[PDB]
Short mmCIF file of all heavy atoms in Angstrom, two decimals:
data_model
loop_
_atom_site.label_atom_id
_atom_site.label_comp_id
_atom_site.label_asym_id
_atom_site.label_seq_id
_atom_site.Cartn_x
_atom_site.Cartn_y
_atom_site.Cartn_z
N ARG A 1 129.66 118.01 102.69
CA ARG A 1 128.78 118.94 103.31
C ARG A 1 127.57 118.22 103.90
O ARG A 1 126.93 117.47 103.19
CB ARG A 1 128.36 120.06 102.37
CG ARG A 1 127.48 121.13 102.99
CD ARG A 1 127.11 122.25 101.95
NE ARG A 1 126.08 121.82 100.99
CZ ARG A 1 125.04 122.63 100.63
NH1 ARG A 1 124.91 123.79 101.09
NH2 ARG A 1 124.17 122.11 99.73
N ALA A 2 127.26 118.46 105.20
CA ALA A 2 126.10 117.83 105.80
C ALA A 2 124.87 118.65 105.32
O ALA A 2 124.89 119.93 105.37
CB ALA A 2 126.26 117.83 107.27
N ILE A 3 123.77 117.99 104.93
CA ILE A 3 122.56 118.63 104.55
C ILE A 3 121.44 118.03 105.45
O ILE A 3 121.28 116.85 105.50
CB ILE A 3 122.20 118.23 103.13
CG1 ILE A 3 123.29 118.77 102.17
CG2 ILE A 3 120.82 118.74 102.71
CD1 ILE A 3 123.21 118.30 100.76
N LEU A 4 120.74 118.88 106.20
CA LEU A 4 119.71 118.39 107.18
C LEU A 4 118.51 117.95 106.29
O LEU A 4 117.87 118.69 105.54
CB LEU A 4 119.32 119.54 108.02
CG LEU A 4 118.25 119.21 109.08
CD1 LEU A 4 118.78 118.07 110.02
CD2 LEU A 4 117.98 120.53 109.98
N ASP A 5 118.14 116.66 106.49
CA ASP A 5 117.08 116.06 105.71
C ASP A 5 115.70 116.26 106.35
O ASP A 5 115.21 115.45 107.07
CB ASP A 5 117.40 114.56 105.52
CG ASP A 5 116.65 113.91 104.39
OD1 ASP A 5 115.65 114.56 103.98
OD2 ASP A 5 117.09 112.86 103.87
N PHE A 6 115.10 117.38 106.05
CA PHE A 6 113.81 117.76 106.63
C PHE A 6 112.60 117.10 105.87
O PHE A 6 111.41 117.54 106.13
CB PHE A 6 113.59 119.26 106.70
CG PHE A 6 113.74 119.81 108.12
CD1 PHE A 6 114.55 119.17 109.07
CD2 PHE A 6 113.01 120.90 108.55
CE1 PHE A 6 114.63 119.63 110.39
CE2 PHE A 6 113.10 121.46 109.86
CZ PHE A 6 113.93 120.75 110.78
N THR A 7 112.81 116.10 105.06
CA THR A 7 111.75 115.40 104.38
C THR A 7 111.89 113.91 104.62
O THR A 7 111.14 113.12 104.06
CB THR A 7 111.65 115.65 102.84
OG1 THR A 7 112.85 115.18 102.19
CG2 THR A 7 111.35 117.11 102.54
N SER A 8 112.84 113.44 105.45
CA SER A 8 113.17 112.06 105.70
C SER A 8 113.26 111.30 104.38
O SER A 8 112.72 110.23 104.22
CB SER A 8 112.05 111.36 106.62
OG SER A 8 111.85 112.12 107.78
N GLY A 9 114.03 111.88 103.48
CA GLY A 9 114.21 111.29 102.11
C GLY A 9 112.97 111.57 101.41
O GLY A 9 112.54 112.75 101.23
N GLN A 10 112.31 110.53 100.86
CA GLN A 10 111.05 110.76 100.13
C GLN A 10 109.89 110.59 101.14
O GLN A 10 109.07 109.64 100.92
CB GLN A 10 110.95 109.83 98.92
CG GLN A 10 109.79 110.26 98.02
CD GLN A 10 109.96 111.71 97.50
OE1 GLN A 10 110.99 112.12 97.09
NE2 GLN A 10 108.87 112.49 97.61
N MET A 11 109.83 111.38 102.20
CA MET A 11 108.78 111.33 103.23
C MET A 11 108.70 109.94 103.86
O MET A 11 107.63 109.50 104.23
CB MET A 11 107.41 111.71 102.58
CG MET A 11 107.46 112.96 101.70
SD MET A 11 107.86 114.54 102.67
CE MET A 11 106.36 114.69 103.65
N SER A 12 109.84 109.26 104.02
CA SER A 12 109.83 107.92 104.46
C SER A 12 110.72 107.39 105.64
O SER A 12 110.34 106.49 106.39
CB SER A 12 110.08 107.02 103.17
OG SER A 12 110.81 105.87 103.43
N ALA A 13 111.93 107.96 105.76
CA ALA A 13 112.88 107.48 106.75
C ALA A 13 112.58 107.91 108.18
O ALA A 13 113.21 108.83 108.75
CB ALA A 13 114.35 107.91 106.38
N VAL A 14 111.57 107.32 108.78
CA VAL A 14 111.17 107.69 110.08
C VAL A 14 112.18 107.43 111.20
O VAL A 14 112.19 108.11 112.25
CB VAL A 14 109.82 106.93 110.52
CG1 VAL A 14 108.66 107.46 109.73
CG2 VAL A 14 110.06 105.35 110.28
N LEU A 15 113.11 106.52 110.97
CA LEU A 15 114.23 106.27 111.93
C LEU A 15 115.47 106.97 111.48
O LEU A 15 116.55 106.72 112.05
CB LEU A 15 114.54 104.76 111.90
CG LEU A 15 113.42 103.75 112.20
CD1 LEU A 15 114.08 102.32 112.31
CD2 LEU A 15 112.81 104.18 113.56
N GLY A 16 115.33 107.87 110.56
CA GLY A 16 116.48 108.53 109.98
C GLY A 16 117.33 107.67 109.07
O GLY A 16 116.87 106.46 108.84
N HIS A 17 118.44 108.10 108.56
CA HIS A 17 119.26 107.30 107.65
C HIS A 17 120.22 106.33 108.38
O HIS A 17 120.83 106.64 109.39
CB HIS A 17 120.13 108.17 106.76
CG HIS A 17 119.25 109.07 105.86
ND1 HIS A 17 118.79 108.62 104.70
CD2 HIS A 17 118.94 110.38 105.98
CE1 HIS A 17 118.11 109.56 104.07
NE2 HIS A 17 118.18 110.68 104.86
N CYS A 18 120.32 105.13 107.78
CA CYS A 18 121.18 104.11 108.25
C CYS A 18 121.20 103.87 109.74
O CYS A 18 122.23 103.97 110.43
CB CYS A 18 122.64 104.51 107.78
SG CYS A 18 122.73 104.88 106.00
N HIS A 19 120.03 103.68 110.28
CA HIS A 19 119.86 103.40 111.70
C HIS A 19 120.59 102.07 112.01
O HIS A 19 120.34 101.10 111.30
CB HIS A 19 118.38 103.40 112.02
CG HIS A 19 118.04 103.29 113.46
ND1 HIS A 19 118.40 102.19 114.19
CD2 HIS A 19 117.49 104.21 114.30
CE1 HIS A 19 118.00 102.36 115.48
NE2 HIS A 19 117.42 103.58 115.51
N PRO A 20 121.48 102.07 113.03
CA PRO A 20 122.18 100.82 113.26
C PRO A 20 121.39 99.55 113.50
O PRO A 20 121.87 98.49 113.17
CB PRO A 20 123.04 101.18 114.54
CG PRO A 20 122.26 102.29 115.16
CD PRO A 20 121.75 103.12 113.99
N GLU A 21 120.13 99.66 113.98
CA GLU A 21 119.36 98.47 114.14
C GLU A 21 118.84 97.96 112.84
O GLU A 21 118.62 96.75 112.62
CB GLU A 21 118.25 98.76 115.14
CG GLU A 21 118.89 99.15 116.45
CD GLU A 21 117.91 99.05 117.55
OE1 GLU A 21 117.24 98.00 117.61
OE2 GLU A 21 117.80 100.00 118.32
N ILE A 22 118.66 98.88 111.84
CA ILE A 22 118.18 98.42 110.58
C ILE A 22 119.37 97.83 109.81
O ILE A 22 119.21 96.85 109.14
CB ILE A 22 117.71 99.65 109.76
CG1 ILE A 22 116.54 100.32 110.54
CG2 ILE A 22 117.30 99.15 108.41
CD1 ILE A 22 115.33 99.34 110.84
N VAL A 23 120.54 98.42 110.00
CA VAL A 23 121.75 97.92 109.39
C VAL A 23 121.95 96.52 109.89
O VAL A 23 122.26 95.58 109.10
CB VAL A 23 122.96 98.80 109.82
CG1 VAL A 23 124.29 98.16 109.40
CG2 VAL A 23 122.80 100.12 109.18
N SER A 24 121.74 96.27 111.16
CA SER A 24 121.93 94.97 111.81
C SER A 24 120.93 93.93 111.30
O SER A 24 121.34 92.83 110.93
CB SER A 24 121.77 95.17 113.33
OG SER A 24 121.84 93.89 113.90
N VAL A 25 119.67 94.25 111.25
CA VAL A 25 118.69 93.31 110.84
C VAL A 25 118.79 93.00 109.33
O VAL A 25 118.68 91.90 108.92
CB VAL A 25 117.21 93.77 111.21
CG1 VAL A 25 116.83 94.93 110.34
CG2 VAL A 25 116.17 92.61 110.93
N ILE A 26 119.18 94.01 108.58
CA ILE A 26 119.33 93.84 107.11
C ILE A 26 120.41 92.87 106.78
O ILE A 26 120.28 92.00 105.93
CB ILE A 26 119.53 95.19 106.35
CG1 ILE A 26 118.22 95.83 106.12
CG2 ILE A 26 120.33 94.95 105.07
CD1 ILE A 26 118.27 97.04 105.22
N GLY A 27 121.57 93.09 107.37
CA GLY A 27 122.73 92.23 107.11
C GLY A 27 122.48 90.84 107.56
O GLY A 27 122.90 89.92 106.91
N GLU A 28 121.82 90.74 108.73
CA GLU A 28 121.48 89.44 109.33
C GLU A 28 120.62 88.57 108.35
O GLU A 28 120.95 87.41 108.12
CB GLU A 28 120.70 89.57 110.67
CG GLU A 28 120.26 88.30 111.27
CD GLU A 28 119.37 88.56 112.55
OE1 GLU A 28 119.09 89.69 112.94
OE2 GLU A 28 119.00 87.54 113.12
N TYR A 29 119.54 89.09 107.87
CA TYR A 29 118.62 88.37 107.01
C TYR A 29 119.15 88.25 105.60
O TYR A 29 118.93 87.28 104.89
CB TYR A 29 117.21 89.00 107.06
CG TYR A 29 116.51 88.53 108.28
CD1 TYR A 29 116.71 89.21 109.49
CD2 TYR A 29 115.78 87.42 108.29
CE1 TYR A 29 116.14 88.69 110.69
CE2 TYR A 29 115.19 86.85 109.44
CZ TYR A 29 115.39 87.53 110.65
OH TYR A 29 114.78 87.04 111.78
N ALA A 30 119.96 89.24 105.12
CA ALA A 30 120.53 89.17 103.79
C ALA A 30 121.42 87.92 103.76
O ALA A 30 121.51 87.24 102.74
CB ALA A 30 121.43 90.39 103.51
N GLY A 31 122.10 87.64 104.86
CA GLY A 31 122.93 86.44 104.89
C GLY A 31 122.31 85.12 105.33
O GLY A 31 122.97 84.07 105.27
N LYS A 32 121.07 85.17 105.79
CA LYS A 32 120.35 84.04 106.37
C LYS A 32 119.05 83.62 105.78
O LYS A 32 118.79 82.40 105.62
CB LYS A 32 120.17 84.34 107.87
CG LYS A 32 119.22 83.45 108.70
CD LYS A 32 118.90 84.16 110.06
CE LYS A 32 118.04 83.34 111.02
NZ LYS A 32 116.62 83.14 110.60
N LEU A 33 118.14 84.55 105.40
CA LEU A 33 116.79 84.19 104.84
C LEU A 33 116.41 85.43 104.07
O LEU A 33 115.98 86.41 104.64
CB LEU A 33 115.83 84.10 106.00
CG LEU A 33 114.81 82.90 106.09
CD1 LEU A 33 113.61 83.43 106.86
CD2 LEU A 33 114.50 82.32 104.75
N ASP A 34 116.52 85.31 102.72
CA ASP A 34 116.29 86.51 101.96
C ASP A 34 114.97 86.67 101.12
O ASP A 34 114.21 87.63 101.37
CB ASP A 34 117.49 86.70 101.02
CG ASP A 34 117.74 85.47 100.12
OD1 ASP A 34 117.13 84.44 100.26
OD2 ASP A 34 118.64 85.60 99.23
N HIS A 35 114.78 85.75 100.20
CA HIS A 35 113.67 85.79 99.26
C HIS A 35 113.17 84.37 99.18
O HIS A 35 114.01 83.46 99.16
CB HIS A 35 114.21 86.26 97.92
CG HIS A 35 113.29 85.99 96.76
ND1 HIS A 35 112.11 86.68 96.60
CD2 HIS A 35 113.35 85.01 95.85
CE1 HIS A 35 111.47 86.19 95.57
NE2 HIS A 35 112.16 85.20 95.07
N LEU A 36 111.88 84.19 99.04
CA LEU A 36 111.30 82.87 98.92
C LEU A 36 110.16 82.77 97.89
O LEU A 36 109.56 83.80 97.51
CB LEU A 36 110.75 82.38 100.23
CG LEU A 36 111.71 82.27 101.43
CD1 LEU A 36 110.91 82.04 102.76
CD2 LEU A 36 112.81 81.09 101.15
N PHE A 37 109.88 81.55 97.45
CA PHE A 37 108.80 81.22 96.60
C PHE A 37 107.60 81.77 97.43
O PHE A 37 107.54 81.55 98.63
CB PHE A 37 108.70 79.70 96.46
CG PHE A 37 107.47 79.23 95.69
CD1 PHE A 37 107.37 79.51 94.28
CD2 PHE A 37 106.49 78.54 96.29
CE1 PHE A 37 106.32 79.04 93.54
CE2 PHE A 37 105.34 78.05 95.55
CZ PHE A 37 105.31 78.34 94.21
N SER A 38 106.62 82.43 96.80
CA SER A 38 105.54 83.02 97.47
C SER A 38 104.54 82.12 98.23
O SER A 38 103.68 82.62 98.97
CB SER A 38 104.74 83.97 96.54
OG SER A 38 105.75 84.91 96.07
N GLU A 39 104.69 80.81 98.11
CA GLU A 39 103.88 79.87 98.84
C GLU A 39 104.57 79.42 100.09
O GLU A 39 104.02 78.68 100.89
CB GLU A 39 103.59 78.64 97.95
CG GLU A 39 102.10 78.44 97.51
CD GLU A 39 101.53 79.58 96.69
OE1 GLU A 39 101.87 79.63 95.46
OE2 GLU A 39 100.71 80.41 97.22
N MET A 40 105.84 79.93 100.29
CA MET A 40 106.59 79.48 101.50
C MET A 40 106.56 80.56 102.54
O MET A 40 106.97 81.67 102.28
CB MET A 40 108.08 79.17 101.12
CG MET A 40 108.18 77.81 100.44
SD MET A 40 109.94 77.65 100.05
CE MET A 40 109.80 76.20 98.95
N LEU A 41 106.07 80.13 103.72
CA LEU A 41 105.99 81.10 104.86
C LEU A 41 107.22 80.99 105.72
O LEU A 41 107.93 79.98 105.73
CB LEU A 41 104.74 80.83 105.74
CG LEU A 41 103.45 81.16 105.04
CD1 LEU A 41 102.29 80.76 106.02
CD2 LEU A 41 103.43 82.67 104.77
N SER A 42 107.50 82.08 106.46
CA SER A 42 108.66 82.15 107.33
C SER A 42 108.31 82.98 108.56
O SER A 42 107.27 83.69 108.56
CB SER A 42 109.85 82.87 106.59
OG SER A 42 109.44 84.14 106.24
N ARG A 43 109.10 82.89 109.61
CA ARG A 43 108.76 83.70 110.83
C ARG A 43 108.67 85.22 110.69
O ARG A 43 107.82 85.82 111.32
CB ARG A 43 109.65 83.25 112.00
CG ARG A 43 109.55 81.78 112.26
CD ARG A 43 110.40 81.37 113.52
NE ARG A 43 110.48 79.93 113.61
CZ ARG A 43 109.57 79.16 114.20
NH1 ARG A 43 108.46 79.68 114.70
NH2 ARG A 43 109.73 77.86 114.21
N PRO A 44 109.58 85.80 109.95
CA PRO A 44 109.46 87.32 109.81
C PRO A 44 108.16 87.74 109.29
O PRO A 44 107.59 88.78 109.70
CB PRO A 44 110.56 87.67 108.88
CG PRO A 44 111.67 86.64 109.26
CD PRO A 44 110.79 85.35 109.30
N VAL A 45 107.62 86.98 108.36
CA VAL A 45 106.35 87.28 107.73
C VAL A 45 105.19 87.06 108.72
O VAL A 45 104.31 87.92 108.87
CB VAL A 45 106.14 86.43 106.45
CG1 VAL A 45 104.74 86.62 105.84
CG2 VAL A 45 107.21 86.91 105.38
N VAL A 46 105.14 85.88 109.36
CA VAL A 46 104.03 85.70 110.26
C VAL A 46 104.15 86.69 111.43
O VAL A 46 103.15 87.27 111.93
CB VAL A 46 103.99 84.22 110.74
CG1 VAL A 46 103.06 84.04 111.97
CG2 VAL A 46 103.59 83.31 109.57
N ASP A 47 105.38 86.95 111.97
CA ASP A 47 105.53 87.90 113.08
C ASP A 47 105.09 89.33 112.62
O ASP A 47 104.46 90.03 113.49
CB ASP A 47 106.96 87.92 113.60
CG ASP A 47 107.42 86.63 114.35
OD1 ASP A 47 106.57 85.89 114.81
OD2 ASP A 47 108.65 86.50 114.48
N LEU A 48 105.53 89.72 111.45
CA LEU A 48 105.15 91.12 111.09
C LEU A 48 103.65 91.21 110.93
O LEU A 48 103.00 92.22 111.31
CB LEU A 48 105.86 91.54 109.78
CG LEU A 48 106.23 93.00 109.61
CD1 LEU A 48 106.09 93.46 108.13
CD2 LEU A 48 105.49 93.99 110.56
#
């Protein structure tokens, strides 16, 4: 049964659920650059 999500989850999913571009970026970085020692910088961090 489809249920219309009028609260975007917990007032958070501004792009709705499972947006394809999020799916894409998530899978990309999960397989390429995930978590680092907190003294190590990377481009996603400086760009964001």
